[PDB]
């Protein structure tokens, strides 16, 4: 409720906040790949090459815009990761430092 506890209880709700943003943000840049991709999938040519390539282009480009932004697929799993790690060490201090105050109280 109040001091380290507190601090303890937003850094957790702050780290579950982390976890859910970079889900949405995958899974916003996963539905604009799924999409571009759909739409090399309904292409009937000279034309066709053009588009496909074009696609393919733009594909490429939310390619790098999302791993400078959430890095690589390695060490966007391994972040969750340690997140989840955190937020797991965090449940147990907090119980401890509960049952402290309580002992005294």
């Known amino acids: 409720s109040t001091g380290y506890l507190e601090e303890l209880e937003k ?3 702050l780290l579950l906040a982390d976890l859910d943003k970079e889900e ?10 799924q999409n ?11 034309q066709t090459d053009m588009t496909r390539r074009q696609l393919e282009y733009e594909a490429r480009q939310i390619r790098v815009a999302m ?5 690589t697929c390695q060490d966007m799993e391994k972040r969750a990761q340690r997140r989840i790690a955190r937020i797991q060490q965090i449940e147990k201090d907090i119980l401890r ?3 402290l105050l309580q002992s005294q109280a």
Request: charged letters at 40%; aromatic letters at 10%; glycine letters at 4%.
């Open 11 to 13: 850094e957790r709700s």
């Open 24 to 33: 949405k943000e995958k899974d916003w840049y996963y539905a604009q790949l």
């Open 36 to 46: 571009l991709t759909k739409r090399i999938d309904s292409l009937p040519s000279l």
């Open 67 to 71: 791993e400078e932004q959430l890095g």
């Open 97 to 99: 430092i509960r049952q």
